[PDB]
Amino acid sequence: HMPVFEDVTRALVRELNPRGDLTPLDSLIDFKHFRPFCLVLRKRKSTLFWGARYVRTDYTLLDLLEPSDLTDSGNFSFKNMLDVQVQGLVEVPKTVKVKGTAGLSQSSTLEVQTLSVAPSALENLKKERKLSADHSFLNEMRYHEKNLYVVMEAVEAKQEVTVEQTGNANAIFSLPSLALLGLQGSLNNNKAVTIPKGCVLAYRVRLLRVFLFNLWDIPYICNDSMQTFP
Amino acid sequence: HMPVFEDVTRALVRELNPRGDLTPLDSLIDFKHFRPFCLVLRKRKSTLFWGARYVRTDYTLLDLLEPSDLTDSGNFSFKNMLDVQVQGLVEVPKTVKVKGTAGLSQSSTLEVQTLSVAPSALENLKKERKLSADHSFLNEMRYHEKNLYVVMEAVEAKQEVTVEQTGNANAIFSLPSLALLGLQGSLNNNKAVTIPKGCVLAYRVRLLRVFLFNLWDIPYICNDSMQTFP
Amino acid sequence: HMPVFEDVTRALVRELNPRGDLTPLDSLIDFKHFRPFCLVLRKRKSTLFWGARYVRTDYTLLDLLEPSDLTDSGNFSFKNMLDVQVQGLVEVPKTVKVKGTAGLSQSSTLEVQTLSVAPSALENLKKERKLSADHSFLNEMRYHEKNLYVVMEAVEAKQEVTVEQTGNANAIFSLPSLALLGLQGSLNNNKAVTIPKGCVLAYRVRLLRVFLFNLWDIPYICNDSMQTFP
């Protein structure tokens, strides 16, 4: 449970845009829902020591209305590889000796490409378009006060890639408390994913503040107290 | 009893969409019933330490009504392989010495492809179509308060694959309680499955809330208290 | 008496659909009666630690009435092989030393294919068709309250295969209770079956609840108390 895709997205984030917005993508499949314009749920938001996250939602903004100008191609070539080994001991007085040696090789030379909805295109959308009010999905959203958020920019693989991630572990117990249980668990896993083209790797988020009656906006000030359905 | 197909589905899940929805497929044969639109029974639902599961049911939603737009092809190539060995001892005072050494190699370089019923297609279905009320199957379902669920998205093998899974075990007892029973059980199994194309590997679930008289929906809020037949 | 065909069916079951329905086939010959639509007798039904079983019956449902749409081909390739060796000792005070070493190699790389009567086809059958009442067979069945069951889906060998299963045993006694009976029984058997095409391997069951006068059904709720002839 040091999964592949999440670790890759986290690594490329810390390489690419530390300090903030870009949140990696936890579920690999749902990229087609983490496209731009799309919606997301708070889902254990950030800390100073954690990384905020969100989840899928099967309705985007165009569908939930009653302007396709995706504008950027900032491209990059991230080649990460590492081999982390760890070895810990514990020698307590019952002769209880624990000793765990793990290791983990990761390898990925992938491409990245960026997208963004034009602020002009958006502002014009919110300007002319208008929100519905009988839409069942959002009807329940306002019912239950989700404070859902929205993704502005994505981070995609401009071409199909693969990731490799292998691990090993070897942990022994030696405890003459229960008949000298001398045990040695172990494993040596490998993993090889073929990240398909278009799979968003890291995405950005942006609040969706819908006014009473009944239009909406997506301000820059996403203050902690901000809320979608007042 | 470390079966092959279930372990594969579990591994690909933790590789692909941890944290939630995707539940592996326990029975291999019933994929043709775990297709999208299909129904499922609670069957020892989730915990914080377990993985929710469900079962077959021989009637889908189209049949149980009185719109085929399966929309996604997010594809992936999962190559897992590992060799876990375990060795435990027990040396208690009757000279009772137990010692078990097991091992397990698993290997699978398979393909995966994803499906999803379009929310638009669905909403339009639930809109125009309407539920029957004399259907015998559902008649008993409402009789007995099953709280059945529904599968939205599937996870299929875009082409035929095979899985290999072998194991070994060697467990000795040495107990001078019954005439020094010194025993050594052992085994070395192998297994090779040919996963046929189209066999759903992991699937997703979604509640089916049918209102009194007599239409229905499948909300996003699948709250614990939610129920199919009120 | 670790027969071949039953062990194979049991192994493929635990590989294919654990946890429930699929019951292996004990008698090899009677597959032509364990076809779909067919009937079966309770015959030491399940436990939490056993595997339910049934038996032949020389009349199916079509014959016992006054719609051939067998619909599935979910196919599989099960390759099992193992070599289990066991060795036990007993050294009790009369110098009675028992010591048994057995072993067992099994090998089978077979194909499997699945069948199922369409729920629609069935429901229409039960709808239009109707049960007889002078049929002698069922006359005795209602006489004697058999609570017979019915098979919906089968599991067949899409082509002819063979199974190999050999065993060995070597058990010695050394008891100076009767003139120092020092004995050593032993054996080394082999077995090779040629499973013919179409031989159902595992089958599924389904109750047959016939109402008073005089039609019938086969509900999903097969509750323990359920009964064929009230």
Added chain:
Amino acid sequence: HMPVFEDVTRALVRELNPRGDLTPLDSLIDFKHFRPFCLVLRKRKSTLFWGARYVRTDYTLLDLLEPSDLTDSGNFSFKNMLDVQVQGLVEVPKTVKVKGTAGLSQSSTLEVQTLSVAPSALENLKKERKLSADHSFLNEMRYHEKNLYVVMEAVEAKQEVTVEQTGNANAIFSLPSLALLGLQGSLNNNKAVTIPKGCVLAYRVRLLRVFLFNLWDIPYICNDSMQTFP
């Protein structure tokens, strides 16, 4: 977390314009927003021991108005490379022995090119052009008193380059406080980025002081007390 792009920008800055203006670029992607004419937010401004920083903002000055004369090509070829190794010990009285050995190789032979908005072109812009007052973005900016700043000159890669940065670490603990925890964490990462053409590396900033009603300027005196929206 000794990221690549930031370290490169910092190194080239200290090589190129120490002592002041040029602030490196923290996020790699947002160069298309750190182009000239663009806006930025204070975001933990400078110290005597730190390096001021800023962030993206999705609206430039041309858009926020109701003159393209980018004038410079001062070009350079920075080839940096180094291998810093560090090794520290701690030997305190509980037998607690900590010992950490890290290392870091960085390599980059890149090109640099400079840009600047002509002071004449600017002065004429601010002269004829005039600020809007209903623009939503800036409406919130004046609401919340951001004291946003503006970028005059950029520092770009006149052609596509790559950067390489690898690291290693090996830190051991030896503490007979908890059962003689003798541990050894370690790692050996590598990283290879393909900096695309046009990616601003270091940029310069410049305040934006908008007068009451309702025009603006960007003075040379950027005094600490200066403020965008009085």
